[PDB]
Design a protein around this ligand. Sequence first.
Ligand SMILES: *[C@@H]1O[C@H](CO)[C@@H](O[C@H]2O[C@H](CO)[C@@H](O[C@@H]3O[C@H](CO)[C@@H](O)[C@H](O)[C@@H]3O)[C@H](O)[C@H]2NC(C)=O)[C@H](O)[C@H]1NC(C)=O
Ligand SMILES: *[C@@H]1O[C@H](CO)[C@@H](O[C@H]2O[C@H](CO)[C@@H](O[C@@H]3O[C@H](CO)[C@@H](O)[C@H](O)[C@@H]3O)[C@H](O)[C@H]2NC(C)=O)[C@H](O)[C@H]1NC(C)=O
Lengths: 221, 212, 246, 49
Amino acid sequence: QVQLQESGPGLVKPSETLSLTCSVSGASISSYYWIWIRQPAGKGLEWIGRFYTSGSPNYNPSLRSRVTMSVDTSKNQFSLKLTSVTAADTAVYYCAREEHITFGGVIVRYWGQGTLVTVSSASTKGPSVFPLAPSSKSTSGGTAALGCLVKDYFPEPVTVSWNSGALTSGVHTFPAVLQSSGLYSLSSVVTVPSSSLGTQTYICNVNHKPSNTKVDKRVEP
Amino acid sequence: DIQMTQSPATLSASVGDRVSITCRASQSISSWLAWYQQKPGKAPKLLIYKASSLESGVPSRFSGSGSGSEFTLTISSLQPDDFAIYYCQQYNSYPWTFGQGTKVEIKRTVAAPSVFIFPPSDEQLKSGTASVVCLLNNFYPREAKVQWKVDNALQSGNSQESVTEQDSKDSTYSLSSTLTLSKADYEKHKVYACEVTHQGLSSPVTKSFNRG
Amino acid sequence: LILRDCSVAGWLLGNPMCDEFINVPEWSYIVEKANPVNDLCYPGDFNDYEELKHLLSRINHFEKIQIIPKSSWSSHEASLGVSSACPYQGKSSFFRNVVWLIKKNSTYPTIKRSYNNTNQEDLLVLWGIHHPNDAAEQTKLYQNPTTYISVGTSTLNQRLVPRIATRSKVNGQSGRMEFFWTILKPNDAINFESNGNFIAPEYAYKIVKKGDSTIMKSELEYGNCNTTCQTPKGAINTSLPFQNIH
Amino acid sequence: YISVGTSTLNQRLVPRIATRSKVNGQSGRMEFFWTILKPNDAINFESNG
Ligand SMILES: *[C@@H]1O[C@H](CO)[C@@H](O[C@H]2O[C@H](CO)[C@@H](O[C@@H]3O[C@H](CO)[C@@H](O)[C@H](O)[C@@H]3O)[C@H](O)[C@H]2NC(C)=O)[C@H](O)[C@H]1NC(C)=O
Ligand SMILES: *[C@@H]1O[C@H](CO)[C@@H](O[C@H]2O[C@H](CO)[C@@H](O[C@@H]3O[C@H](CO)[C@@H](O)[C@H](O)[C@@H]3O)[C@H](O)[C@H]2NC(C)=O)[C@H](O)[C@H]1NC(C)=O
């Protein structure tokens, strides 16, 4: 049961540096190699580098000049530092565990979740959550839809969960749309039995990590 | 240093078909290739190592073959949860490299959407803007057209659509068409309507609300 | 009577699970198990639960009146408040005997409905109180806050007030529901007057037979023969004067 | 009025205004109540006076 999780600012002024920290639970960072990998937009994966507390590291030659990777045995922290970030360096970043040798060689079974680093001079702006009430009047057979619109947010990473993880079936959390303002807007929708509208309530937990906003809003007819 | 070229970077097959994805290499990798399944918005999940060794917990239907310069990932009975981008990797020599990935999608029975309209939120209205939303839910032919009629006045501008990726269970899609207007907020107009046009519908389905 | 994995409370309150016990046979020596799987689905407790159990020791058969008002009554409330808990074979449902009363058009007018069986047998009327987690929740179900529930019978009159407070999540719901019961005599009446938070009943039980029974708890399952002796451990055959079995 | 609101016990109490015998120079009395609050259990006090 090894767990990897990344922490990242979301925004890095261009021509400056990128600092990322992958915290590891369930393994001593002293006794494993660790990997940083990059994924811009929907494009392919790019392996950034490898490091080991007691072993010389190897970094991808495209990024070598800018990459430095360190380890903090006290807090089990795997670090990534990208000097002189360009616009191209805007990407999702993943940390992973380089397993010990097997008769299958070096394998990576354990991955992080990924943090999206955008590279902009723009300013962190928090979302605005507004409900999408159900038109109970609509016959719509026996089904009815609920929503939580999330508008005017500038760091793209935005997470939406319904009823604190209790609602998972029927949820369609749409992809971001970049508006003319330069700000993003998500819609999250849930199809529901029309019957359960009266007795059960419906809530949205929306957590814009870069702005540290966590607006939870109710959807009442 | 060593490139990894995959094929075809776009597939589509109904459930049960065999699928096979080829991955070629600038140099010989002997058997140091690995295959990954990246689902929508998730980390890659390692499918195959040593170019043939299935990792534990991967279904019997995945199978990797090849040595040297050409390699093949094969799915025996493509299932709905297999919708994903599939990648390929050299752990032969550094720097490590990946393929461009191939997106395996799923052909399905045609599904008619279910349409919903959402009027703008009063709180937003107080802020000084307004948004109406058409929700098209669970349709297979991703291709559909949604029109915005404002008292029978089509208005292409002030509208943005976004699409879900394929569901793992249904392999269906959903659309959100967001009409964003605030000229007199949405005053000067009594009715709003979505004209939704799709193959699963004999004649276009409009839905409409006249609140404001 | 076999109760498989249903509590007595569930069998009497009509829990969607084990609704296989609605056509009660005319005979009943309680075979209940300790900690049944399907009990009071929607988190709650039964007032004077063991007293009811003791009366059941005498009772041997029941008859659902199916006359207590009805779900059709929809004058002031909505008869459509099924819960995401109490799943019927995996389908969200609620106790059939009691009813999830809920405000109608953003308005929950106090209902002074009342019933007197005038039948020849006694009654086992059942009702409940919903203790919500938020006042907002209370308003969503009953726009009236700080509600009251008045039970007016010939012998017992108790006014009850719901305790609005978030508790632990059970079956996805931290709200609780108290279940009350009373024995309505033939020609005895019961008046219900509720501000809000009322779970009125729709069925009750006519005491068909009050013979001799017990609530022996036995994790054993039925096995088909028939003696003049029964114990939660088993059934005796020879007839000596004393017993060290149970 | 004095309202004690816990997860298990809710009791509303009203003071009995009445002169009694003088004890320690005071005929007023004070009732003392107690409850066991579980970890993660709450107690709401609402008092008129
Ligand atoms: C329905 O509930 C009544 C509520 O108390 C309950 O009380 C009844 O008590 C007896 C039982 O029927 C009735 O006495 C009546 O006497 C007249 C003689 O003038 C007869 O003609 C009549 O048939 C009846 O026996 C009470 O009048 C009645 N109380 C009421 C209605 O105020 C009863 O169980 C039941 N009501 C009736 C009429 O059966
Ligand atoms: C202070 O008093 C609360 C009053 O009931 C009491 O209830 C709490 O119950 C648990 C215990 O912490 C909380 O559950 C939470 O679950 C979220 C997951 O989304 C966690 O992030 C969070 O840390 C917590 O474990 C309830 O939320 C909470 N009830 C409330 C506050 O309504 C608790 O004893 C205590 N509150 C907390 C937050 O500890």
